[PDB]
PDB file of all heavy atoms in Angstrom:
ATOM      1  N   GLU A  19     -12.413 -19.524   2.584  1.00 29.63           N
ATOM      2  CA  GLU A  19     -12.507 -19.139   1.182  1.00 29.63           C
ATOM      3  C   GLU A  19     -11.210 -18.564   0.626  1.00 29.63           C
ATOM      4  O   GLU A  19     -10.610 -17.654   1.214  1.00 29.63           O
ATOM      5  CB  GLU A  19     -13.634 -18.106   1.018  1.00 29.63           C
ATOM      6  CG  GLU A  19     -13.894 -17.749  -0.435  1.00 29.63           C
ATOM      7  CD  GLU A  19     -14.911 -16.634  -0.595  1.00 29.63           C
ATOM      8  OE1 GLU A  19     -15.978 -16.702   0.062  1.00 29.63           O
ATOM      9  OE2 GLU A  19     -14.646 -15.707  -1.400  1.00 29.63           O
ATOM     10  N   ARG A  20     -10.772 -19.084  -0.509  1.00 26.59           N
ATOM     11  CA  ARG A  20      -9.542 -18.612  -1.111  1.00 26.59           C
ATOM     12  C   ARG A  20      -9.775 -17.274  -1.815  1.00 26.59           C
ATOM     13  O   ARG A  20     -10.715 -17.125  -2.614  1.00 26.59           O
ATOM     14  CB  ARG A  20      -9.004 -19.652  -2.102  1.00 26.59           C
ATOM     15  CG  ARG A  20      -7.539 -19.468  -2.407  1.00 26.59           C
ATOM     16  CD  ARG A  20      -6.986 -20.625  -3.193  1.00 26.59           C
ATOM     17  NE  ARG A  20      -7.733 -20.888  -4.419  1.00 26.59           N
ATOM     18  CZ  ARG A  20      -7.391 -21.843  -5.290  1.00 26.59           C
ATOM     19  NH1 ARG A  20      -6.332 -22.598  -5.061  1.00 26.59           N
ATOM     20  NH2 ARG A  20      -8.125 -22.045  -6.384  1.00 26.59           N
ATOM     21  N   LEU A  21      -8.922 -16.301  -1.506  1.00 26.10           N
ATOM     22  CA  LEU A  21      -9.025 -14.970  -2.075  1.00 26.10           C
ATOM     23  C   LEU A  21      -8.005 -14.784  -3.170  1.00 26.10           C
ATOM     24  O   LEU A  21      -8.180 -13.919  -4.048  1.00 26.10           O
ATOM     25  CB  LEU A  21      -8.757 -13.909  -0.993  1.00 26.10           C
ATOM     26  CG  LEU A  21      -9.543 -14.085   0.298  1.00 26.10           C
ATOM     27  CD1 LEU A  21      -9.242 -12.916   1.234  1.00 26.10           C
ATOM     28  CD2 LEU A  21     -11.028 -14.178  -0.010  1.00 26.10           C
ATOM     29  N   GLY A  22      -6.943 -15.576  -3.129  1.00 30.04           N
ATOM     30  CA  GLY A  22      -5.909 -15.469  -4.142  1.00 30.04           C
ATOM     31  C   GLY A  22      -4.972 -16.668  -4.150  1.00 30.04           C
ATOM     32  O   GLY A  22      -4.776 -17.321  -3.133  1.00 30.04           O
ATOM     33  N   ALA A  23      -4.409 -16.976  -5.315  1.00 26.53           N
ATOM     34  CA  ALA A  23      -3.479 -18.086  -5.452  1.00 26.53           C
ATOM     35  C   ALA A  23      -2.400 -17.660  -6.417  1.00 26.53           C
ATOM     36  O   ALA A  23      -2.678 -17.028  -7.446  1.00 26.53           O
ATOM     37  CB  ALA A  23      -4.194 -19.328  -5.959  1.00 26.53           C
ATOM     38  N   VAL A  29      -3.799 -17.149  -0.480  1.00 25.97           N
ATOM     39  CA  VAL A  29      -4.319 -16.276   0.556  1.00 25.97           C
ATOM     40  C   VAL A  29      -5.780 -16.635   0.753  1.00 25.97           C
ATOM     41  O   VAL A  29      -6.568 -16.681  -0.197  1.00 25.97           O
ATOM     42  CB  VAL A  29      -4.223 -14.796   0.175  1.00 25.97           C
ATOM     43  CG1 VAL A  29      -4.864 -13.955   1.273  1.00 25.97           C
ATOM     44  CG2 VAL A  29      -2.744 -14.423   0.017  1.00 25.97           C
ATOM     45  N   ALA A  41      -7.453 -12.956   7.508  1.00 33.53           N
ATOM     46  CA  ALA A  41      -6.919 -13.282   6.182  1.00 33.53           C
ATOM     47  C   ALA A  41      -5.681 -14.114   6.476  1.00 33.53           C
ATOM     48  O   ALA A  41      -4.905 -13.778   7.380  1.00 33.53           O
ATOM     49  CB  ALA A  41      -6.534 -12.021   5.456  1.00 33.53           C
ATOM     50  N   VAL A  42      -5.500 -15.205   5.739  1.00 35.21           N
ATOM     51  CA  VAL A  42      -4.365 -16.087   5.965  1.00 35.21           C
ATOM     52  C   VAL A  42      -3.546 -16.284   4.711  1.00 35.21           C
ATOM     53  O   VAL A  42      -4.082 -16.687   3.677  1.00 35.21           O
ATOM     54  CB  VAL A  42      -4.829 -17.462   6.478  1.00 35.21           C
ATOM     55  CG1 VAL A  42      -3.629 -18.382   6.723  1.00 35.21           C
ATOM     56  CG2 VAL A  42      -5.625 -17.298   7.770  1.00 35.21           C
ATOM     57  N   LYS A  43      -2.257 -15.995   4.801  1.00 34.81           N
ATOM     58  CA  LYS A  43      -1.353 -16.138   3.667  1.00 34.81           C
ATOM     59  C   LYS A  43      -0.483 -17.353   3.940  1.00 34.81           C
ATOM     60  O   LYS A  43       0.170 -17.436   4.978  1.00 34.81           O
ATOM     61  CB  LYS A  43      -0.487 -14.886   3.532  1.00 34.81           C
ATOM     62  CG  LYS A  43       0.459 -14.856   2.340  1.00 34.81           C
ATOM     63  CD  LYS A  43       1.095 -13.460   2.248  1.00 34.81           C
ATOM     64  CE  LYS A  43       2.184 -13.374   1.219  1.00 34.81           C
ATOM     65  NZ  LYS A  43       2.706 -11.984   1.241  1.00 34.81           N
ATOM     66  N   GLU A  58       8.267  -9.973   6.126  1.00 29.81           N
ATOM     67  CA  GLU A  58       7.163  -9.038   5.988  1.00 29.81           C
ATOM     68  C   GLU A  58       6.400  -8.982   7.320  1.00 29.81           C
ATOM     69  O   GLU A  58       6.084  -7.919   7.842  1.00 29.81           O
ATOM     70  CB  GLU A  58       6.254  -9.542   4.848  1.00 29.81           C
ATOM     71  CG  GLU A  58       5.047  -8.734   4.566  1.00 29.81           C
ATOM     72  CD  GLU A  58       4.194  -9.337   3.478  1.00 29.81           C
ATOM     73  OE1 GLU A  58       4.443 -10.498   3.090  1.00 29.81           O
ATOM     74  OE2 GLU A  58       3.265  -8.670   3.013  1.00 29.81           O
ATOM     75  N   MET A  62       5.816  -5.843  10.124  1.00 30.61           N
ATOM     76  CA  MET A  62       4.507  -5.470  10.639  1.00 30.61           C
ATOM     77  C   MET A  62       4.442  -5.565  12.167  1.00 30.61           C
ATOM     78  O   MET A  62       3.592  -4.935  12.782  1.00 30.61           O
ATOM     79  CB  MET A  62       3.425  -6.355  10.008  1.00 30.61           C
ATOM     80  CG  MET A  62       3.324  -6.219   8.480  1.00 30.61           C
ATOM     81  SD  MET A  62       2.265  -7.487   7.786  1.00 30.61           S
ATOM     82  CE  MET A  62       0.634  -6.753   7.981  1.00 30.61           C
ATOM     83  N   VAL A  71      -2.956  -2.253   7.747  1.00 32.86           N
ATOM     84  CA  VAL A  71      -3.443  -3.617   7.988  1.00 32.86           C
ATOM     85  C   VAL A  71      -2.626  -4.222   9.116  1.00 32.86           C
ATOM     86  O   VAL A  71      -1.388  -4.235   9.093  1.00 32.86           O
ATOM     87  CB  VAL A  71      -3.363  -4.468   6.691  1.00 32.86           C
ATOM     88  CG1 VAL A  71      -3.763  -5.916   6.988  1.00 32.86           C
ATOM     89  CG2 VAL A  71      -4.306  -3.895   5.631  1.00 32.86           C
ATOM     90  N   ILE A  84       0.935 -16.452   7.592  1.00 12.08           N
ATOM     91  CA  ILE A  84       0.965 -15.081   8.070  1.00 12.08           C
ATOM     92  C   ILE A  84      -0.527 -14.748   8.157  1.00 12.08           C
ATOM     93  O   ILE A  84      -1.228 -14.793   7.149  1.00 12.08           O
ATOM     94  CB  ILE A  84       1.610 -14.093   7.086  1.00 12.08           C
ATOM     95  CG1 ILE A  84       3.114 -14.354   6.964  1.00 12.08           C
ATOM     96  CG2 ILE A  84       1.339 -12.665   7.555  1.00 12.08           C
ATOM     97  CD1 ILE A  84       3.805 -13.427   5.974  1.00 12.08           C
ATOM     98  N   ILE A  85      -0.998 -14.437   9.356  1.00 10.15           N
ATOM     99  CA  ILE A  85      -2.401 -14.128   9.562  1.00 10.15           C
ATOM    100  C   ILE A  85      -2.574 -12.642   9.846  1.00 10.15           C
ATOM    101  O   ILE A  85      -1.869 -12.069  10.680  1.00 10.15           O
ATOM    102  CB  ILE A  85      -2.995 -14.936  10.742  1.00 10.15           C
ATOM    103  CG1 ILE A  85      -2.870 -16.437  10.475  1.00 10.15           C
ATOM    104  CG2 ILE A  85      -4.468 -14.595  10.927  1.00 10.15           C
ATOM    105  CD1 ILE A  85      -1.564 -17.024  10.889  1.00 10.15           C
ATOM    106  N   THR A  86      -3.520 -12.011   9.168  1.00  6.51           N
ATOM    107  CA  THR A  86      -3.718 -10.580   9.358  1.00  6.51           C
ATOM    108  C   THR A  86      -5.173 -10.154   9.482  1.00  6.51           C
ATOM    109  O   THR A  86      -6.094 -10.969   9.412  1.00  6.51           O
ATOM    110  CB  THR A  86      -3.120  -9.802   8.188  1.00  6.51           C
ATOM    111  OG1 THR A  86      -3.882 -10.060   7.006  1.00  6.51           O
ATOM    112  CG2 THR A  86      -1.684 -10.235   7.951  1.00  6.51           C
ATOM    113  N   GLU A  87      -5.333  -8.849   9.681  1.00  6.44           N
ATOM    114  CA  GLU A  87      -6.620  -8.179   9.795  1.00  6.44           C
ATOM    115  C   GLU A  87      -7.353  -8.287   8.453  1.00  6.44           C
ATOM    116  O   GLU A  87      -6.828  -7.865   7.417  1.00  6.44           O
ATOM    117  CB  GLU A  87      -6.372  -6.723  10.166  1.00  6.44           C
ATOM    118  CG  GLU A  87      -7.537  -5.749   9.979  1.00  6.44           C
ATOM    119  CD  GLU A  87      -7.214  -4.362  10.532  1.00  6.44           C
ATOM    120  OE1 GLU A  87      -6.064  -3.900  10.345  1.00  6.44           O
ATOM    121  OE2 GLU A  87      -8.102  -3.735  11.136  1.00  6.44           O
ATOM    122  N   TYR A  88      -8.559  -8.845   8.485  1.00  6.80           N
ATOM    123  CA  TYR A  88      -9.352  -9.023   7.267  1.00  6.80           C
ATOM    124  C   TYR A  88     -10.076  -7.740   6.879  1.00  6.80           C
ATOM    125  O   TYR A  88     -10.755  -7.123   7.693  1.00  6.80           O
ATOM    126  CB  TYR A  88     -10.391 -10.129   7.461  1.00  6.80           C
ATOM    127  CG  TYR A  88     -11.195 -10.450   6.217  1.00  6.80           C
ATOM    128  CD1 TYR A  88     -10.599 -11.123   5.142  1.00  6.80           C
ATOM    129  CD2 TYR A  88     -12.534 -10.071   6.098  1.00  6.80           C
ATOM    130  CE1 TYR A  88     -11.326 -11.409   3.983  1.00  6.80           C
ATOM    131  CE2 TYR A  88     -13.257 -10.353   4.935  1.00  6.80           C
ATOM    132  CZ  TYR A  88     -12.646 -11.023   3.886  1.00  6.80           C
ATOM    133  OH  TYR A  88     -13.347 -11.317   2.732  1.00  6.80           O
ATOM    134  N   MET A  89      -9.913  -7.347   5.619  1.00  8.56           N
ATOM    135  CA  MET A  89     -10.557  -6.137   5.086  1.00  8.56           C
ATOM    136  C   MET A  89     -11.667  -6.614   4.149  1.00  8.56           C
ATOM    137  O   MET A  89     -11.410  -7.075   3.044  1.00  8.56           O
ATOM    138  CB  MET A  89      -9.538  -5.279   4.331  1.00  8.56           C
ATOM    139  CG  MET A  89      -8.342  -4.823   5.186  1.00  8.56           C
ATOM    140  SD  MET A  89      -8.820  -3.908   6.660  1.00  8.56           S
ATOM    141  CE  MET A  89      -9.486  -2.389   5.944  1.00  8.56           C
ATOM    142  N   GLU A  90     -12.902  -6.494   4.624  1.00  9.08           N
ATOM    143  CA  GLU A  90     -14.084  -6.951   3.907  1.00  9.08           C
ATOM    144  C   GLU A  90     -14.222  -6.554   2.438  1.00  9.08           C
ATOM    145  O   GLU A  90     -14.638  -7.374   1.632  1.00  9.08           O
ATOM    146  CB  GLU A  90     -15.349  -6.533   4.656  1.00  9.08           C
ATOM    147  CG  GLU A  90     -16.652  -7.211   4.154  1.00  9.08           C
ATOM    148  CD  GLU A  90     -16.739  -8.704   4.502  1.00  9.08           C
ATOM    149  OE1 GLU A  90     -16.793  -9.039   5.720  1.00  9.08           O
ATOM    150  OE2 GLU A  90     -16.746  -9.536   3.570  1.00  9.08           O
ATOM    151  N   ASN A  91     -13.901  -5.308   2.088  1.00  9.09           N
ATOM    152  CA  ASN A  91     -14.065  -4.877   0.703  1.00  9.09           C
ATOM    153  C   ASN A  91     -12.844  -4.981  -0.195  1.00  9.09           C
ATOM    154  O   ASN A  91     -12.806  -4.344  -1.238  1.00  9.09           O
ATOM    155  CB  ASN A  91     -14.634  -3.471   0.653  1.00  9.09           C
ATOM    156  CG  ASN A  91     -16.125  -3.442   0.880  1.00  9.09           C
ATOM    157  OD1 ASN A  91     -16.871  -4.208   0.246  1.00  9.09           O
ATOM    158  ND2 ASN A  91     -16.587  -2.572   1.774  1.00  9.09           N
ATOM    159  N   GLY A  92     -11.875  -5.777   0.203  1.00  8.18           N
ATOM    160  CA  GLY A  92     -10.687  -5.989  -0.627  1.00  8.18           C
ATOM    161  C   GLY A  92      -9.872  -4.768  -0.977  1.00  8.18           C
ATOM    162  O   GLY A  92      -9.882  -3.773  -0.253  1.00  8.18           O
ATOM    163  N   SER A  93      -9.151  -4.847  -2.102  1.00  5.52           N
ATOM    164  CA  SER A  93      -8.301  -3.750  -2.539  1.00  5.52           C
ATOM    165  C   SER A  93      -9.101  -2.587  -3.104  1.00  5.52           C
ATOM    166  O   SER A  93     -10.163  -2.791  -3.699  1.00  5.52           O
ATOM    167  CB  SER A  93      -7.284  -4.230  -3.585  1.00  5.52           C
ATOM    168  OG  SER A  93      -7.913  -4.534  -4.820  1.00  5.52           O
ATOM    169  N   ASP A  96      -9.953  -2.523  -6.830  1.00  4.90           N
ATOM    170  CA  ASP A  96     -11.070  -3.395  -7.193  1.00  4.90           C
ATOM    171  C   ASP A  96     -12.408  -2.843  -6.727  1.00  4.90           C
ATOM    172  O   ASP A  96     -13.397  -2.862  -7.461  1.00  4.90           O
ATOM    173  CB  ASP A  96     -10.900  -4.793  -6.584  1.00  4.90           C
ATOM    174  CG  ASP A  96      -9.807  -5.605  -7.275  1.00  4.90           C
ATOM    175  OD1 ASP A  96      -9.565  -5.379  -8.480  1.00  4.90           O
ATOM    176  OD2 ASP A  96      -9.199  -6.475  -6.614  1.00  4.90           O
ATOM    177  N   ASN A 139      -2.605  -1.791  -3.382  1.00 15.90           N
ATOM    178  CA  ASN A 139      -2.116  -2.059  -2.041  1.00 15.90           C
ATOM    179  C   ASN A 139      -2.796  -1.265  -0.922  1.00 15.90           C
ATOM    180  O   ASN A 139      -2.208  -1.066   0.156  1.00 15.90           O
ATOM    181  CB  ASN A 139      -0.597  -1.912  -2.001  1.00 15.90           C
ATOM    182  CG  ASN A 139       0.100  -3.004  -2.793  1.00 15.90           C
ATOM    183  OD1 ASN A 139      -0.362  -4.148  -2.806  1.00 15.90           O
ATOM    184  ND2 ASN A 139       1.192  -2.662  -3.458  1.00 15.90           N
ATOM    185  N   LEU A 141      -6.306  -1.467   1.227  1.00 13.70           N
ATOM    186  CA  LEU A 141      -7.471  -2.318   1.459  1.00 13.70           C
ATOM    187  C   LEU A 141      -8.605  -1.501   2.066  1.00 13.70           C
ATOM    188  O   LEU A 141      -8.367  -0.548   2.803  1.00 13.70           O
ATOM    189  CB  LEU A 141      -7.112  -3.516   2.353  1.00 13.70           C
ATOM    190  CG  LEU A 141      -6.030  -4.434   1.761  1.00 13.70           C
ATOM    191  CD1 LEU A 141      -5.794  -5.637   2.655  1.00 13.70           C
ATOM    192  CD2 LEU A 141      -6.453  -4.884   0.389  1.00 13.70           C
ATOM    193  N   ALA A 151      -1.470  -1.589   3.033  1.00 13.00           N
ATOM    194  CA  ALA A 151      -1.151  -3.006   3.078  1.00 13.00           C
ATOM    195  C   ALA A 151       0.095  -3.358   2.271  1.00 13.00           C
ATOM    196  O   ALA A 151       0.680  -2.517   1.594  1.00 13.00           O
ATOM    197  CB  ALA A 151      -2.325  -3.831   2.597  1.00 13.00           C
ATOM    198  N   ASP A 152       0.470  -4.634   2.354  1.00 13.36           N
ATOM    199  CA  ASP A 152       1.621  -5.191   1.658  1.00 13.36           C
ATOM    200  C   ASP A 152       2.913  -4.448   1.944  1.00 13.36           C
ATOM    201  O   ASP A 152       3.310  -3.575   1.184  1.00 13.36           O
ATOM    202  CB  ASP A 152       1.388  -5.197   0.151  1.00 13.36           C
ATOM    203  CG  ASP A 152       2.333  -6.136  -0.564  1.00 13.36           C
ATOM    204  OD1 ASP A 152       3.448  -6.399  -0.070  1.00 13.36           O
ATOM    205  OD2 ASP A 152       1.942  -6.644  -1.642  1.00 13.36           O
ATOM    206  N   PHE A 153       3.563  -4.821   3.035  1.00 12.65           N
ATOM    207  CA  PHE A 153       4.818  -4.188   3.442  1.00 12.65           C
ATOM    208  C   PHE A 153       5.992  -5.070   3.018  1.00 12.65           C
ATOM    209  O   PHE A 153       7.038  -5.073   3.660  1.00 12.65           O
ATOM    210  CB  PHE A 153       4.820  -3.991   4.963  1.00 12.65           C
ATOM    211  CG  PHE A 153       3.659  -3.175   5.452  1.00 12.65           C
ATOM    212  CD1 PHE A 153       2.449  -3.793   5.757  1.00 12.65           C
ATOM    213  CD2 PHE A 153       3.737  -1.788   5.528  1.00 12.65           C
ATOM    214  CE1 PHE A 153       1.332  -3.046   6.129  1.00 12.65           C
ATOM    215  CE2 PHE A 153       2.624  -1.031   5.895  1.00 12.65           C
ATOM    216  CZ  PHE A 153       1.425  -1.672   6.187  1.00 12.65           C
TER     217      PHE A 153
HETATM  218  C1  LIG B 301      -2.684 -11.983   4.506  1.00 37.86           C
HETATM  219  C2  LIG B 301      -1.603 -11.030   4.027  1.00 37.86           C
HETATM  220  C3  LIG B 301      -0.215 -11.175   4.446  1.00 37.86           C
HETATM  221  C4  LIG B 301       0.816 -10.285   4.009  1.00 37.86           C
HETATM  222  C5  LIG B 301       0.388  -9.243   3.155  1.00 37.86           C
HETATM  223  C6  LIG B 301      -0.961  -9.020   2.701  1.00 37.86           C
HETATM  224  C7  LIG B 301      -1.269  -7.814   1.828  1.00 37.86           C
HETATM  225  C8  LIG B 301      -1.978  -9.928   3.144  1.00 37.86           C
HETATM  226  N1  LIG B 301      -3.287  -9.775   2.753  1.00 37.86           N
HETATM  227  C9  LIG B 301      -4.267  -9.159   3.678  1.00 37.86           C
HETATM  228  O1  LIG B 301      -3.916  -8.585   4.715  1.00 37.86           O
HETATM  229  C10 LIG B 301      -5.669  -9.031   3.477  1.00 37.86           C
HETATM  230  C11 LIG B 301      -6.679  -8.415   4.347  1.00 37.86           C
HETATM  231  N2  LIG B 301      -7.967  -8.405   3.852  1.00 37.86           N
HETATM  232  C12 LIG B 301      -8.289  -8.951   2.603  1.00 37.86           C
HETATM  233  N3  LIG B 301      -9.576  -8.851   2.100  1.00 37.86           N
HETATM  234  C13 LIG B 301     -10.088  -9.116   0.798  1.00 37.86           C
HETATM  235  C14 LIG B 301     -11.493  -9.415   0.721  1.00 37.86           C
HETATM  236  C15 LIG B 301     -11.982  -9.794  -0.576  1.00 37.86           C
HETATM  237  C16 LIG B 301     -11.010  -9.850  -1.710  1.00 37.86           C
HETATM  238  N4  LIG B 301     -11.303 -10.283  -2.976  1.00 37.86           N
HETATM  239  C17 LIG B 301     -12.404  -9.601  -3.620  1.00 37.86           C
HETATM  240  C18 LIG B 301     -13.306 -10.604  -4.319  1.00 37.86           C
HETATM  241  N5  LIG B 301     -12.433 -11.495  -5.100  1.00 37.86           N
HETATM  242  C19 LIG B 301     -13.370 -12.459  -5.660  1.00 37.86           C
HETATM  243  C20 LIG B 301     -11.607 -12.362  -4.237  1.00 37.86           C
HETATM  244  C21 LIG B 301     -10.564 -11.376  -3.729  1.00 37.86           C
HETATM  245  C22 LIG B 301      -9.621  -9.531  -1.643  1.00 37.86           C
HETATM  246  C23 LIG B 301      -9.176  -9.152  -0.361  1.00 37.86           C
HETATM  247  N6  LIG B 301      -7.331  -9.528   1.819  1.00 37.86           N
HETATM  248  C24 LIG B 301      -6.029  -9.614   2.157  1.00 37.86           C
HETATM  249  N7  LIG B 301      -5.058 -10.204   1.232  1.00 37.86           N
HETATM  250  C25 LIG B 301      -5.146 -10.781  -0.081  1.00 37.86           C
HETATM  251  C26 LIG B 301      -6.270 -11.018  -1.017  1.00 37.86           C
HETATM  252  C27 LIG B 301      -6.122 -11.616  -2.348  1.00 37.86           C
HETATM  253  C28 LIG B 301      -4.785 -11.987  -2.767  1.00 37.86           C
HETATM  254  C29 LIG B 301      -3.623 -11.789  -1.926  1.00 37.86           C
HETATM  255  C30 LIG B 301      -3.822 -11.193  -0.581  1.00 37.86           C
HETATM  256  N8  LIG B 301      -2.948 -10.881   0.430  1.00 37.86           N
HETATM  257  C31 LIG B 301      -3.707 -10.298   1.496  1.00 37.86           C
END
Side-chain angles (χ1 to χ4, degrees):
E19 186 185 313
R20 200 171 55 178
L21 311 184
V29 176
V42 180
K43 184 173 172 180
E58 179 183 11
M62 298 170 85
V71 175
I84 291 179
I85 301 86
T86 69
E87 164 174 40
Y88 185 72
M89 301 303 292
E90 192 71 65
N91 281 311
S93 71
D96 288 331
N139 292 323
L141 300 184
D152 198 332
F153 303 87

